[PDB]
Structure formats: structure tokens, C-alpha cells
């Protein structure tokens, strides 16, 4: 399940399509816990493409329901990211994921 909560500004028309590479200043957060990832530290703003299952499902679907300039707030259920296995030592099993996501993309 993906629950979009958008900080408004942008254009509301420039949606990501297939074969496009988008630029995201993502910021992870665990529910009732601390951070676990941020691209604001490295300043390498994570140029990835659409439709190749490189990112997780809960982050891939949230990018399609955003536009250029928008600033969402994801809420990823455990079944779409890691909730059965759990990432080793970083993401515990059966955990709810929160993502502060900015989309200032290209293409």
C-alpha cells in the first residue's frame, strides 16, 4: 500500500514515463525510530530509471503519482519493501517504511 501525502508546489502535469531517468532527493525514516538513509548527505541525487525493479516497489509506485517540483511523503507497507526478509542489520523484518521524497527530475 502506498499513501501519498503531498507538499503542494510544482506543476501537476509532468509525470514520469517509461524509459525516463529521474532525480530524487530521497530521505528515509523508520516509524517510531530514527533515520536510516538520506541523499542530502552525499549530495549525489540518485539518478535512476523507471520500470527495471532496481528500487523497491513501494518507492517505485510513489514516483509515478508525483510531478516535477512536488514533494511527497510515502508510507510503504512491509509487504512491498522488506517485511518478510528484512535488510541485514539496517532494516528489521516486519517494519513500516516512511520516505520524504522530492522529485526534481530530468527527461
UniProtKB/Swiss-Prot annotation:
GO biological process, one term: positive regulation of sequestering of calcium ion
Tissue and organ distribution: Detected in heart muscle (at protein level). Isoform 1 and isoform 2 are ubiquitous with highest levels in brain and thymus.
Gene name of this polypeptide: FKBP1B
Residues spanning the signal sequence: none
PANTHER family: PEPTIDYL-PROLYL CIS-TRANS ISOMERASE, PEPTIDYL-PROLYL CIS-TRANS ISOMERASE FKBP1B
GO cellular component: calcium channel complex; cytoplasm; membrane; sarcoplasmic reticulum membrane; Z disc
PROSITE patterns: FKBP_PPIASE (PS50059)
Stated role: Has the potential to contribute to the immunosuppressive and toxic effects of FK506 and rapamycin. PPIases accelerate the folding of proteins. It catalyzes the cis-trans isomerization of proline imidic peptide bonds in oligopeptides.
Domain PPIase FKBP-type: residue ranges: 19-107
Activity regulation as described: Inhibited by both FK506 and rapamycin.
Catalytic activity: [protein]-peptidylproline (omega=180) = [protein]-peptidylproline (omega=0)
InterPro entries named in the record: FKBP-type_PPIase, PPIase_dom_sf, PPIase_FKBP_dom
Subunit structure: Identified in a complex composed of RYR2, FKBP1B, PKA catalytic subunit, PRKAR2A, AKAP6, and the protein phosphatases PP2A and PP1. Interacts directly with RYR2.
Broad class of where this protein is predominantly found: cytoplasm
Catalytic activity, EC: 5.2.1.8
Subcellular location: Cytoplasm; Sarcoplasmic reticulum
Record-given protein name: Peptidyl-prolyl cis-trans isomerase FKBP1B
